[PDB]
């Protein structure tokens, strides 16, 4: 029961001029909702935004259709369409039916690459480089589970969309069994079909089986775990002739077998003590060591489908995989060691925490022949500190000798009393070389440096029924704001009124460098967090 | 006696209820309880044993940094888990766990990235479980 109009809202943007929102709420059933919203845009046209929410036994979900008939600005991707129709379709679903059935949908499709640049939606932003289209249905009980999936992506560049691989379909299966004698056993399996739009690119069917036997020895203090794993993979790669006769392309093989055994031994111990002058507090000292061995296997005859360099933080030090997917299994012959100290107080609250770890390589990690070689090459650390009941601090850093010392680092401090008072400082750094290594096809600093971003966010009451929010993010190398948000709120017996300004980097001018910004200043009534969660860098509460 | 000794949940044996008993999070929690020598039984009805109730969990993903051209640089995955510890001796002690991960985005390798995300999520779930078990200490005291 609510089927009326909703109080309108308005705004003024640097790209669409004056904008006017007039929402209408339907209320079809206790478990069905709809919203139809004319959205006038001075310079662009009249948009219609439809949102349909449902709640059923297979799960809860939301569908959405945005439709703008006659765009008077857009022209085309090709530079020439004129009077084109802008549209967006969204479907999200999540649910566990009858405890054993599992359904998940994350589908987004737009009419053109420049949609989110020009139009505002809850299902996208100017930071997005593509749209995700994923369907997932699976069964699961205590002993095993299986999952069928369709994974496809709409990349907002011709090149990206053309060469973007799809998983269609993907089958993931897991079988578990404890107490198989002294061991715990686990078998994982996968069957996938990778295809892409570009006819030149190879298609592939990949099958993978991976049994794992585990000997876990646990205690009140410390624990050790021995693990034997078998990685078995078969590839059926269909390779077009045009691909094989390229002067720059790798010689792929039609049928590929890869079988690699993996040995891992991982141990951890927990010392502790009552601190001396400070009585009641406890300091814990937790050493951890892991040896990993995987033999080398040349995999140049396998193409890349779903495989990228995984990003390692302090935890990732003890991860047995370097890459994602299954197209590259690096040889391993290394020891990862780490030390974790904790501090508990009177009430057994973890108040301080610090971890430092490292990886020592006995031999080079390889995946092929396409080649600062051994020793302690990777370092990583993180830290957390509960300064008081309302103030928190945490941060982390990563080093790789092969990429020139420091690669990643970040720190964030946050104060918060209730949900009216909040302050947050943060800094993020990423070396150029790290970006060039971890995510290629977006390399060294050709105008694209590493990351060095300082950020502040706040929400504070200032008068009797007044409230102000702010958010400033600054790029220190380019010496310019990345994002900025200033806001006021007014309260009375009723609820709240919100007024806000926002200026963000939204594009790039190719000639004579410089970045393209956009302005927004608007009003709604229908706050605080709702305004904090609106920019390209929305507020996420730390801790 | 002053310097380092080896020890460190006192009390064992509990009930385990969850909104998603066959979900991956519940599996991680079971693995972790099992690693800490906690016997997970089927009793209910005649409680007089502490219980661990997983109310629910939510996942989040936002952009935390951008490049000069406005495109996303680093993305952050967030896992929230809400739990409750019911001890028959006294009242209920609520628990909450938040886990964070960060990775660079790459529109030219979207599928790969999705894969990466899944891995991350897995790890995060595991980490959550760990904290939960450790937080049982806070419940004890
Ligand atoms: C392979 C990874 C871990 C192995 C390292 C230690 C192996 C020691 O275990 C010996 C294996 O023998 C197990 C057979 O035990 C009997 C199983 O059936 C008894 C159940 O009633
Ligand atoms: C110049 C190359 C060799 C010189 C230094 C080699 C050092 C090798 O010794 C490393 C000691 O650690 C061995 C593995 O650590 C044990 C891990 O597994 C135990 C589980 O608790
Ligand atoms: C088939 C390709 C040829 C590659 C074989 C190279 C073999 C070189 O092995 C060097 C081994 O380095 C010694 C590692 O030290 C042992 C540490 O691990 C001890 C486990 O606790
Ligand atoms: C509102 C709650 C009370 C907060 C007051 C702080 C009480 C003191 O206990 C703090 C325990 O944490 C230890 C501090 O951690 C050390 C960090 O700095 C050491 C590194 O040089
Ligand atoms: C306990 C006081 C300080 C602890 C705060 C947490 C910080 C831990 O992580 C540090 C990460 O800081 C990033 C390193 O700074 C990068 C800039 O230097 C790069 C050189 O160009």
């Amino acid at each position: 029961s609510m089927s009326g109009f909703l109080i309108p809202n308005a705004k003024f943007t640097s790209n669409n001029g004056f904008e006017f929102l007039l929402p209408y709420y339907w209320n079809i059933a206790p478990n069905f909702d709809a919203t139809i919203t004319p959205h006038y845009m001075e310079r662009r046209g009249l948009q219609w935004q439809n949102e349909f929410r449902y709640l059923l036994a297979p799960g809860s979900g939301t569908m959405a259709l945005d439709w703008l008939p006659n765009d008077r600005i857009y022209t085309g991707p090709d530079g020439t369409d004129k009077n084109a129709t802008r549209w967006l379709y969204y479907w999200g679903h999540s649910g566990v039916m009858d405890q054993v059935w599992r359904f998940n949908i994350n589908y987004t499709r737009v009419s053109d690459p420049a949609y989110f640049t020009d139009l505002t939606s809850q299902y996208g932003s100017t930071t997005d480089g593509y749209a995700t289209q994923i369907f997932t249905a699976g069964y699961a009980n205590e002993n095993w589970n299986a999952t069928l999936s369709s994974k496809q992506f709409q990349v907002f560049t011709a090149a990206g969309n053309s060469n973007a691989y799809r998983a269609q379909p993907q089958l993931d299966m897991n079988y578990y069994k404890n107490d198989v004698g002294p061991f715990d056993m686990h078998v994982y399996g996968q069957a996938a079909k990778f295809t892409s739009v570009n006819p030149t690119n190879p298609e592939a069917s990949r099958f993978h089986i991976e049994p794992t036997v585990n000997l876990p020895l646990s205690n009140s203090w410390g624990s050790i775990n021995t693990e034997a794993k078998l990685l078995a993979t078969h590839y059926q790669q269909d390779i077009p002739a045009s691909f094989a006769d390229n002067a720059s392309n790798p010689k792929l093989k039609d049928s590929v077998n890869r079988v690699l055994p993996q040995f891992k031994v991982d141990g951890k111990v927990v010392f502790d003590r009552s601190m001396d002058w400070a009585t009641g507090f406890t300091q814990t000292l937790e050493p951890r060591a892991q040896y990993l061995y995987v033999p080398y296997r040349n995999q140049d005859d396998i193409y890349i489908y779903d495989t990228t360099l995984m990003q390692s933080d302090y935890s990732g030090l003890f991860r047995d995989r370097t890459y994602s997917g299954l197209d590259r299994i690096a040889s391993a012959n290394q020891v990862s060691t780490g030390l974790t100290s904790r501090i508990y107080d009177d009430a057994r609250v973890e108040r301080f925490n610090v971890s430092v770890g490292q990886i020592y390589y006995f031999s080079r990690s390889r995946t092929g022949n396409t080649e600062n070689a051994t020793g302690s090459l990777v370092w990583a650390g993180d830290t957390f500190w509960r300064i008081n009941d309302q103030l928190g601090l945490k941060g982390g850093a990563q080093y790789d000798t092969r990429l020139g010392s420091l690669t990643l680092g970040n720190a964030i401090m946050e104060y918060r009393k209730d949900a009216d008072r909040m302050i947050q400082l943060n800094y993020r750094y990423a070396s150029p070389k790290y970006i060039q290594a971890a995510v290629p096809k977006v390399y060294n600093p050709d105008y694209q440096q590493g990351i060095s971003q300082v950020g502040t966010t706040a929400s504070w009451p200032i008068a009797d029924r007044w409230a102000i929010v702010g958010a400033y993010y600054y790029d220190t190398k380019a010496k310019q704001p990345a994002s900025q948000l200033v806001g006021l709120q007014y309260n009375t017996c009723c609820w709240a009124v919100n007024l806000g300004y926002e200026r963000k980097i939204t594009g790039w001018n190719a000639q004579g460098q410089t970045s393209k910004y956009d302005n927004k200043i608007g009003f709604n009534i229908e706050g605080t967090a709702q305004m904090l969660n609106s920019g390209i860098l929305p507020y996420q509460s730390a801790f | 006696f002053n310097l380092r000794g080896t020890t460190q949940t006192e009390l064992q044996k509990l009930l385990l209820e969850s909104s998603d008993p066959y979900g991956p999070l519940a599996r991680s929690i079971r693995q972790q309880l099992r690693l800490n020598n906690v016997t997970i039984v089927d009793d209910a009805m005649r409680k007089d044993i502490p219980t661990l109730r997983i109310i629910g969990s939510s996942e989040s993903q936002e952009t935390v940094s951008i490049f000069r051209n406005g495109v996303a640089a680093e993305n952050q995955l967030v896992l929230h888990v809400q739990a409750q510890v019911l001890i028959p001796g006294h009242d209920i002690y609520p628990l909450q766990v938040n886990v964070f991960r960060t990775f660079f985005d790459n529109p030219l390798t979207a599928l790969a990235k999705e894969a990466e995300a899944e891995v991350l999520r897995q790890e995060m779930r595991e980490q959550a479980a760990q904290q939960l078990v450790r937080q049982l200490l806070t419940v004890h005291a």
Side-chain angles (χ1 to χ4, degrees), chain A residues 1-370 373-443 445-543, chain B residues 1-44 48-141:
Chain A
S1 61
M2 260 281 309
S3 293
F5 277 90
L6 299 190
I7 175 159
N9 61 85
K11 60 181 61 181
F12 185 87
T13 70
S14 61
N15 63 326
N16 293 325
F18 192 77
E19 297 187 1
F20 188 79
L21 278 302
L22 183 59
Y24 183 81
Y25 178 74
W26 186 351
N27 188 218
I28 296 92
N31 54 330
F32 294 96
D33 282 334
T35 288
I36 295 99
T37 300
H39 178 198
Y40 175 73
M41 287 165 292
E42 175 179 2
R43 310 176 196 172
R44 197 166 297 274
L46 177 61
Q47 198 191 46
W48 291 88
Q49 308 190 338
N50 313 279
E51 171 163 342
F52 169 61
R53 294 191 303 255
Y54 62 92
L55 168 60
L56 302 173
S60 65
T62 303
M63 300 175 57
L65 179 54
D66 289 12
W67 181 67
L68 173 63
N70 294 277
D71 192 313
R72 305 192 299 271
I73 316 166
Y74 179 56
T75 61
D78 53 336
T80 59
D81 187 350
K82 248 263 168 25
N83 304 346
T85 309
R86 310 280 221 145
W87 56 263
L88 174 145
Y89 176 77
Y90 169 84
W91 189 4
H93 182 91
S94 78
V96 180
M97 184 179 62
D98 298 324
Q99 294 192 337
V100 296
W101 302 103
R102 312 187 69 80
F103 303 108
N104 292 306
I105 296 185
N106 182 36
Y107 187 94
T108 297
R109 188 189 182 188
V110 294
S111 57
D112 55 88
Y115 188 94
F116 300 112
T117 307
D118 300 337
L119 296 168
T120 289
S121 68
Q122 185 175 3
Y123 317 102
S125 76
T126 175
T127 56
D128 294 24
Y130 59 93
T132 300
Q133 299 164 358
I134 287 180
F135 298 87
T136 284
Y139 178 85
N141 55 37
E142 69 279 3
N143 297 125
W144 76 287
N145 59 69
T147 295
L148 194 59
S149 298
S150 181
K151 299 172 182 177
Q152 179 179 347
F153 306 94
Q154 183 180 7
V155 189
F156 297 156
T157 57
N161 193 40
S162 182
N163 294 314
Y165 273 99
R166 300 153 180 175
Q168 194 152 351
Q170 218 184 62
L171 181 59
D172 289 315
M173 300 186 67
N174 288 277
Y175 174 70
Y176 301 88
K177 198 174 184 183
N178 297 331
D179 301 320
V180 190
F183 311 110
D184 294 336
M185 296 186 176
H186 165 232
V187 183
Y188 168 76
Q190 182 182 104
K193 177 61 178 177
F194 303 116
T195 61
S196 67
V197 174
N198 180 17
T200 301
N201 288 357
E203 293 185 3
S205 294
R206 188 181 67 190
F207 305 85
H208 180 76
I209 192 62
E210 179 185 328
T212 299
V213 180
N214 203 42
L215 178 59
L217 296 181
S218 178
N219 208 352
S220 61
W221 58 268
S223 66
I224 191 173
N225 190 40
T226 311
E227 179 179 335
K229 178 178 291 185
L230 189 58
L231 293 161
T233 315
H234 175 246
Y235 279 93
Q236 190 67 35
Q237 292 182 133
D238 308 306
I239 320 159
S242 58
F243 189 95
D245 191 356
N246 198 326
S248 291
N249 280 347
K251 299 300 177 182
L252 306 180
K253 173 180 189 183
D254 192 48
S255 179
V256 178
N257 289 322
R258 184 188 59 195
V259 179
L260 292 170
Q262 170 182 319
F263 169 70
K264 183 211 300 180
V265 50
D266 197 348
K268 175 186 176 182
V269 166
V270 181
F271 302 91
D272 62 11
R273 69 180 179 91
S274 298
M275 305 193 62
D276 306 314
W277 299 349
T279 312
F281 289 76
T282 299
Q283 189 180 6
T284 78
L285 193 71
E286 314 175 8
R288 178 181 182 181
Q290 177 193 225
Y291 176 73
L292 181 64
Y293 181 80
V294 174
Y296 163 69
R297 175 59 170 179
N298 196 328
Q299 302 166 59
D300 288 334
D301 55 337
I302 309 177
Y303 205 57
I304 302 301
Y305 301 102
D306 66 342
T307 293
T308 187
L309 182 57
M310 293 280 315
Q311 175 176 329
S312 50
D313 67 314
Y314 171 75
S315 306
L317 291 172
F318 302 91
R319 177 164 57 233
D320 58 347
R321 303 282 189 276
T322 297
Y323 299 96
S324 70
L326 291 165
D327 302 324
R328 290 298 187 277
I329 306 298
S331 68
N333 192 7
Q334 64 208 43
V335 174
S336 299
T337 58
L339 183 57
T340 293
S341 189
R342 305 182 191 270
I343 288 182
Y344 303 82
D345 65 339
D346 308 8
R348 286 299 182 184
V349 174
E350 186 178 0
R351 302 208 55 175
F352 179 80
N353 155 248
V354 56
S355 310
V356 174
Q358 158 266 4
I359 306 183
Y360 189 98
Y361 295 86
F362 294 112
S363 57
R364 279 188 324 174
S365 299
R366 292 192 286 171
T367 54
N369 220 351
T370 182
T374 61
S376 176
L377 297 186
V378 171
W379 288 79
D382 70 88
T383 175
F384 160 83
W385 183 13
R386 184 169 179 170
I387 306 170
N388 56 67
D389 285 330
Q390 290 82 27
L391 185 60
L393 173 70
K394 79 173 193 177
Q398 305 173 16
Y399 296 81
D400 195 324
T401 307
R402 297 167 295 187
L403 296 178
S405 69
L406 184 71
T407 58
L408 277 168
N410 64 272
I412 184 173
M413 177 214 72
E414 183 171 341
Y415 174 89
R416 185 168 185 176
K417 187 48 192 156
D418 294 354
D420 57 322
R421 303 172 183 267
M422 183 235 88
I423 305 180
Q424 184 177 104
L425 272 148
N426 77 279
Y427 174 74
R428 306 197 55 88
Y429 172 81
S431 169
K433 283 175 291 189
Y434 178 78
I435 301 190
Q436 179 186 346
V439 280
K441 332 300 177 175
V442 52
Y443 68 95
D446 290 18
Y447 86 60
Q448 219 53 89
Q449 193 63 285
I451 299 299
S452 189
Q453 177 183 293
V454 183
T456 43
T457 310
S459 177
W460 215 266
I462 53 152
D464 283 343
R465 28 178 171 69
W466 286 17
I468 187 176
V469 296
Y472 196 78
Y473 285 88
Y474 197 88
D475 180 10
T476 77
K477 299 296 179 181
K479 293 163 57 178
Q480 72 171 4
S483 178
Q484 176 184 5
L485 184 143
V486 189
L488 294 177
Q489 173 171 343
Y490 181 68
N491 293 281
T492 40
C493 185
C494 290
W495 302 4
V497 176
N498 300 126
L499 168 64
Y501 174 83
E502 170 181 344
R503 181 173 189 263
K504 49 182 179 181
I505 294 189
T506 190
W508 177 261
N509 198 349
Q511 190 58 57
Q513 315 308 342
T514 71
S515 305
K516 301 182 181 171
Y517 287 80
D518 272 332
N519 293 19
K520 283 180 56 182
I521 169 173
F523 94 90
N524 68 340
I525 303 182
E526 38 181 295
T528 314
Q530 183 183 350
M531 192 144 49
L532 291 171
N533 193 343
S534 55
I536 53 174
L537 301 174
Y539 163 67
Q540 277 189 320
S541 164
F543 315 102
Chain B
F1 33 98
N2 194 6
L3 194 37
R4 305 304 184 176
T6 57
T7 323
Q8 197 178 355
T9 306
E10 178 59 22
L11 194 170
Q12 300 306 328
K13 151 102 189 64
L14 57 71
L15 291 178
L16 182 61
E17 293 177 352
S18 178
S19 56
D20 202 346
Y22 303 142
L25 174 56
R27 166 162 273 98
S28 296
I29 295 178
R30 280 189 158 92
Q31 292 176 355
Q32 281 293 325
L33 288 172
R34 191 176 180 272
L35 182 60
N36 286 265
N37 300 117
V38 171
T39 306
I40 312 175
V41 321
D42 61 322
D43 297 329
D48 49 28
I49 57 184
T51 75
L52 178 57
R53 177 192 305 176
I54 284 78
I55 296 178
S57 66
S58 54
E59 300 178 359
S60 307
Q61 177 172 358
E62 302 295 345
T63 300
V64 295
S65 70
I66 60 169
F67 293 112
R68 292 182 180 177
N69 58 339
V71 75
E74 296 167 322
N75 290 316
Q76 179 176 254
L77 306 180
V78 186
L79 173 62
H80 312 273
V81 173
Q82 294 180 340
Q84 283 174 350
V85 179
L86 292 76
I87 297 182
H90 36 274
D91 52 19
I92 311 177
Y93 191 89
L95 297 177
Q96 183 157 46
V97 171
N98 300 316
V99 181
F100 302 85
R101 286 293 189 287
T102 291
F103 68 105
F104 285 87
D105 199 22
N106 193 342
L108 302 185
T109 66
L111 185 62
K113 282 301 168 177
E114 191 282 335
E116 178 177 10
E118 283 177 353
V119 174
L120 290 184
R121 288 193 185 100
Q122 172 59 26
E123 294 182 14
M124 293 174 61
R125 279 185 287 267
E126 284 164 3
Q127 184 174 341
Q130 299 184 19
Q131 297 188 16
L132 267 181
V133 170
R134 288 205 303 267
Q135 286 197 17
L136 271 179
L137 201 75
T138 70
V139 183
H140 184 46

